[PDB]
Write a protein that binds this ligand. Structure first.
Ligand code: SF4
Ligand code: SF4
Ligand code: SF4
Ligand code: SF4
Ligand code: SF4
Ligand code: SF4
Ligand code: SF4
Ligand code: SF4
Ligand code: SF4
Ligand code: SF4
Ligand code: SF4
Ligand code: SF4
Ligand code: FES
Ligand code: FES
Ligand code: FES
Lengths: 554, 554, 554
């Protein structure tokens, strides 16, 4: 399709939604602040201005036609773009040094490139809202009111706890009545953070606490989540490698970690316990369908939204809490040191794990939760060339896991691990998987001795409401709050989009492929733990089982 | 240092051996056919001609002086270089399509670049020698008489079984009296092949036998050596990856391999058996010092050169033969299929393993041995993107190994594995390692209950003669024929030089770092094999022990 | 679209012609020898075999269907592919060292990758045809009978002087009765060479003559064509640069060229003379339409095919011959040296220029014509880093040209230059350009004082026949034998396809953009030449005008 841009012949696609996208797909970029994430919409920034027929208009809302002559760069357009950018910056909290988005901020880059060196306009005061009550931290002084977070929270996560409020100069994205986020129905999934193009939404940093713990004389123990190892190479701009976790082990020992364990061992433990709980439930037809309890965002969502299903939740705690309780109540004893001597650090891809660790039912097990980004900050701070670090394995006795346990890092992993345990105990004849829609997988399972069942994997909160409204023929339901599962967790490296998450899933799959242990029962250390310290039902319930309670405001 | 090249000011190093090297280090390349490998010398090709003071001379033998004016490209020099290249090509066997060096041949590249399209001179007949009696294959019709192989065999391998013979136009690199290589004292290390810049020395290809076996109805079993996985990425010009072996497993299953096992499991088995043999020898002070028998080139060298030490050789067979005997005499029975139904393929970095498999003491265990280059040819033939292949583990019950077993792939690995087994059974207090010279490491070992001993690791035949002439205070000696061990084996990808071998050793070390099994006794499958099928001493001797005999001509 | 390849889920395009192309577009490569150039067709090689439904078939002729399960690599397919490649090689003239396609040959690469080291079959004798009568050189011993050249010559060039002859084992691509190519109606465009995937069709190399001339005491003068500078960077795998021609000047002076002139100066001269010839013809309505005579392939084609239009041909000689005659008959005199002392080298993108230089009407003006590939061979032979060469301008007085003269290197350049000269003398009001089809541009020209005319640019012989059969309303017709003009000449670097030719045209356009002289009359040196040595009509006719004669066989 023939169009003229700045008096030059350009061929674009025959069918395109608007001029801006067509030029972008043909390699011509128009400055703009609307396209910021996968949840973006056009029309707000007004910087995409072009001149067609001697009149200036936004190219994001212009349908191309054959023979159109467009000037993308005129003195008038230059002045208008500079004015709009200056308008944004004048009332922007310009403190990039302490900003979470520093270095990966489109606004900072435009300020650099547009040669903005003095604020011509006035930094007129706005009634800014600062919120630090939750692991998700809000600071509206940096918000550019793009609305990406509102759409993510409403349409993708199905929560909608943040909305545009007020109007005009006092327009602000905020919770109802500016309530602290920790007191709302926010599930702390961090997806809004994953999509925010500024530092307005960020993750609470806890590096200072880790440094303090490392400097003292208490025993610091780290444990790395499955999905951390499949994504942390992005922070360093290097290709994946299945040896990433062992490089992390070496780095952590270098900076003074006493032990580093693999949370995928905890995933093996959780899948082994949950398979038995589910089998008992199926045998006595009680408390069905069973919901997995490994995603704390889903758990909080259920406590807010489905108080009737709280008993249907799996009573087994998540891998982080399970492994942490083992470390604190069994390993500490086996080591001869008081539990008060152990400082347990959990490296996770998830903001909701920070909330989970601080839950009343788990108080004092996990001392701090650091996300993949915080771990990357530790590495970058050291300036060590992580890619040249010699790998070494995780520490015994919680440093080995089956590929099924490592599979927890992506949606469907825990269900696959449960099926693996069931098959290894009570064989499975066949499994018929079906995909009703984009993020829903329904599998029919027939055991050797009958008693078939259906299980579903749902990734992305918000799909849950409709699925639960239309499917009563499923016995076990796995729910992951984040699309693609934990590889797309809120604490993962930014940018955190669909293509990057798919690549992370591929990395995790390749990492699982080099593992020789196929099922949790082939984990000799897990079997030894069960045989030595989790023999009776009472001890197992105390160590690996937790409770849930309804959540309401008044 | 100021010099003028083609009327241009060039600064070179103050201290340099000759003009050619100085220009090369400053980025100026002079065409030449002398620098071909790490065993090269200057003066033979005569193509490095330059004009200094109006007279033409070789730059490889010209000491630079301040203010020298050199013309590197004159019509006269052009004619002389073209004439010399045409002289080489006229009597060269020009059949690149079936040449082993096709695509990585400097002569082929020069023929392409010099625009040689017709042989002006005459392809005058030479009494060419073709030799295909050994896995190392000779074809003097391609030899450019560079002499690199003669130097490698004499000075680096200490064998010197190939030499310049005759003179003038009939000059030829050959064995004494043109004897077949298989009937000489050649140890078949393949180092000459690793250094040859043409196809004159090549490795016998056995792909057609593998295709025939795969096409039949017999069960094809593959087993991959430790050092194959640390080097095969070079053939594809991609970065290392610790997951390489599992990608190989996936590829081999794709092209119809029934099982793929890890020869490093055989390394664990061999180290476990050899540690006990050595401990018995130390206890009764008999048959010392003990020589490792894992390198077949060293074994053949000893049979030729040290008939008095043949009893001092370890009686345990090499990992290839040990694992192959297990597969043929135990696994075949456990599978319910006759041993005649199994076709056992061994993928090795070594040409001497082809000879070893065909030895009389091993006849009919290993059906074919393919080198890393042949495996790369299989992959390239398929055109499959190996880097995108999903990894999967080795097959049970011989698909797992300790890091010590995988360490066999580089010099010192078998000694380290033996020390690991001894430590796990009879603890080791300390080990004092010393390096008398470049490829010799001497370690003092003290066990818990006294009975200390010294062991040496020697890599590179030729160092052995002098070490054995000057050290009577060592109890165990590990000998690897190839410098750096098997990462620098004759069957490894070309070019095969010191820097590449060091990088391969680094890759293998990183691969060993991600392994959770530290010692052979932690290998549950190895323990189960010993407990089920290698219980009595008679069965163990029959399965894992071999004999040696003197080698002499008459 | 969901398909399974080697038991793996692959998504391909919904609408695709065959499985092979679909897999290729999805990143899966199947070995094959059918896809070799832009003139290729499927079905001949038979190496693209896949297994679908347990039966083997060619993937190039398999329409994909949803759910198809295909095995691209089975032992049976492996054997068949190896057998087919061995069948090709057995009867192939395997002399890569002296082959023109050495290093860029798909067959050589497959021989390397398939591990073919011995010809199992027999090199059964074929009645091979060797032809060296023309600058296009034929050697059927290397032909793989792909048929690409037959299609190029018939359908793209509209000549069809080469065809498949005989059948079975004696099938051969040849001229009628194996007549020498120089005695046929071949126009020597070299497009068949540009498309041939082997060395069966090559360009006659003339480097040895240049070396001989440079070594003697005669004055060697070089002149570089416009399109040589826009394409020679491909041989060195480096990005374009508008300074390429001046680097060539520096390199040529380094290897002993006395002078280097710019043939684009000759293009300015030719356009200036041809504009006046055309204006006279228009004024007296004689010998119309005028055909440009700058493309010698077109000239030979007309002499064979349109003896009635020979008077309609422009009588002005081509830029090479015009500039060469100036150098030999004017510059030699101005230099004080006999014309016999000058050796004139022409660097061209064209094989037909080699023929033109040897024409009877031009005998002894241009001593040798070397193509871009031969010039690249000179550079590579020197091993000089051409990208680091300091540029220097062309030599006076023929080293400067207008952008219009440099534009000759791509189709439409000479017409644009003629229009530029006419406009600078007799202004042009407007020009209305129209594109009846892919390689035809028709422009309406109105001068200031009326007398409008139409001119057409046709690139790619074969379009000419139909255009001349349907357009009698054009006064001037520019014909270029090669698609895109001289940037796609037969002597250009290989591969020589549409995308590469378009990129070369872009490079030439960028080179023209940095030129400050807009029209030939702004060339002060050209004006001085006309004023000093081309004053009278007789001298101008003798120096810049040539004749044509009919071509027929009997
Ligand atoms: S969002 Fe942060 S990094 Fe970007 S401009 Fe504002 S303060 Fe700077
Ligand atoms: S963390 Fe999740 S639920 Fe909470 S505001 Fe952000 S997107 Fe909404
Ligand atoms: S918080 Fe971030 S994503 Fe939400 S509107 Fe503000 S800038 Fe946009
Ligand atoms: S899906 Fe994973 S990353 Fe996302 S909230 Fe749940 S546990 Fe955290
Ligand atoms: S050594 Fe082999 S590849 Fe090199 S020129 Fe000779 S035949 Fe060709
Ligand atoms: S294989 Fe080794 S011993 Fe034999 S000729 Fe070559 S370098 Fe010498
Ligand atoms: S065999 Fe190879 S290395 Fe030895 S002299 Fe001949 S070309 Fe050189
Ligand atoms: S060192 Fe390794 S590669 Fe070299 S000969 Fe010995 S076993 Fe073979
Ligand atoms: S076409 Fe030339 S380069 Fe290709 S295989 Fe034949 S001889 Fe070798
Ligand atoms: S040079 Fe042109 S006309 Fe001659 S055979 Fe080749 S394609 Fe045909
Ligand atoms: S001459 Fe070249 S293009 Fe023509 S059929 Fe033979 S190989 Fe193919
Ligand atoms: S178009 Fe140019 S390259 Fe092609 S034949 Fe004509 S003059 Fe030669
Ligand atoms: S891109 Fe933001 S308004 Fe057009
Ligand atoms: S480099 Fe070979 S003789 Fe100088
Ligand atoms: S690609 Fe050649 S026959 Fe299919």
């Amino acid at each position: 399709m023939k169009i003229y841009v700045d008096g030059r012949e350009v061929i674009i696609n025959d069918n395109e939604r608007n001029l801006l996208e067509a030029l972008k797909n043909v390699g011509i970029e128009i400055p703009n602040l609307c396209y910021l994430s996968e949840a973006s919409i056009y029309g707000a920034c007004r910087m995409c201005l072009v001149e067609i027929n001697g009149q200036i208009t936004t190219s994001c809302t212009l349908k191309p036609y054959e023979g159109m002559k467009v000037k993308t760069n005129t003195p008038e357009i230059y002045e208008m773009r500079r004015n709009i950018l200056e308008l944004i910056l004048a009332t922007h909290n310009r403190d990039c040094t302490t900003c979470d988005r520093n270095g990966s901020c489109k606004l900072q880059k435009y300020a650099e490139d547009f040669g903005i060196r003095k604020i011509r306009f006035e930094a007129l005061k706005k009634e800014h809202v600062r919120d630090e009550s939750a692991p998700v931290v809000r600071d509206t002084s940096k918000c550019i009111l793009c609305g990406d977070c509102v759409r993510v929270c409403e349409e993708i996560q199905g929560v909608g706890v943040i909305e545009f409020a007020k109007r005009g100069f006092e327009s602000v994205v905020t919770t109802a009545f500016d309530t602290p986020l920790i007191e709302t129905e926010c599930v702390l999934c961090g997806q809004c953070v994953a999509y925010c193009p500024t530092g307005a939404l960020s993750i609470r940093n806890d590096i200072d606490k880790l440094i303090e713990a490392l400097e003292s004389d208490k025993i610091v123990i780290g444990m790395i989540a499955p999905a951390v190892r499949a994504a942390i190479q992005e922070e360093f701009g290097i290709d994946e490698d299945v040896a990433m976790a062992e490089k992390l082990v070496s780095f952590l020992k270098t900076i003074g970690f006493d032990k580093v364990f693999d949370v995928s061992f905890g995933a093996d433990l959780v899948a082994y316990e949950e398979a038995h709980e589910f089998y008992e439930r199926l045998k006595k037809g009680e408390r069905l369908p069973q919901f997995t309890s490994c995603c704390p965002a889903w758990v909080k969502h259920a406590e807010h939204t489905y108080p009737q299903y709280l008993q249907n939740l799996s009573s087994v705690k998540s891998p982080q809490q399970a492994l942490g309780t083992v470390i604190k109540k069994i390993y500490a004893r086996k080591l001869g040191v008081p539990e008060e001597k152990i400082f347990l650090v959990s490296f996770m891809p998830c903001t909701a794990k920070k909330f989970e660790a601080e839950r009343e039912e788990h108080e004092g097990i996990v001392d701090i939760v650091l996300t993949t980004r915080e771990l990357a900050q530790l590495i970058k701070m050291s300036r060590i060339d992580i890619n040249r670090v010699e790998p070494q394995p995780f520490d015994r006795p919680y440093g080995v896991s089956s590929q099924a346990g490592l599979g927890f890092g992506k949606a469907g992993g825990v269900f696959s691990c449960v099926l693996s345990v069931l098959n290894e105990e009570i064989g499975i004849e066949k499994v018929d998987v079906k995909s009703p829609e984009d993020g829903i997988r329904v599998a029919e399972v027939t055991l050797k001795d009958g008693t078939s069942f259906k299980g579903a994997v749902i990734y992305g909160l918000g799909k849950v409401k409709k699925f639960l409204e239309e499917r009563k023929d499923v016995e076990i339901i796995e729910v992951m709050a984040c699309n693609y599962g934990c590889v797309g967790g809120g604490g993962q490296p930014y940018p955190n989009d669909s293509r990057i998450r798919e690549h992370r899933a591929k990395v995790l799959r390749d990492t699982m492929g080099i593992k020789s242990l196929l099922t949790p029962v082939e984990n000799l250390f897990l079997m030894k733990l069960y045989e030595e310290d989790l023999k009776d039902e009472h001890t197992r319930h105390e160590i690996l089982h937790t409770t849930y309670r309804p959540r309401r405001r008044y």
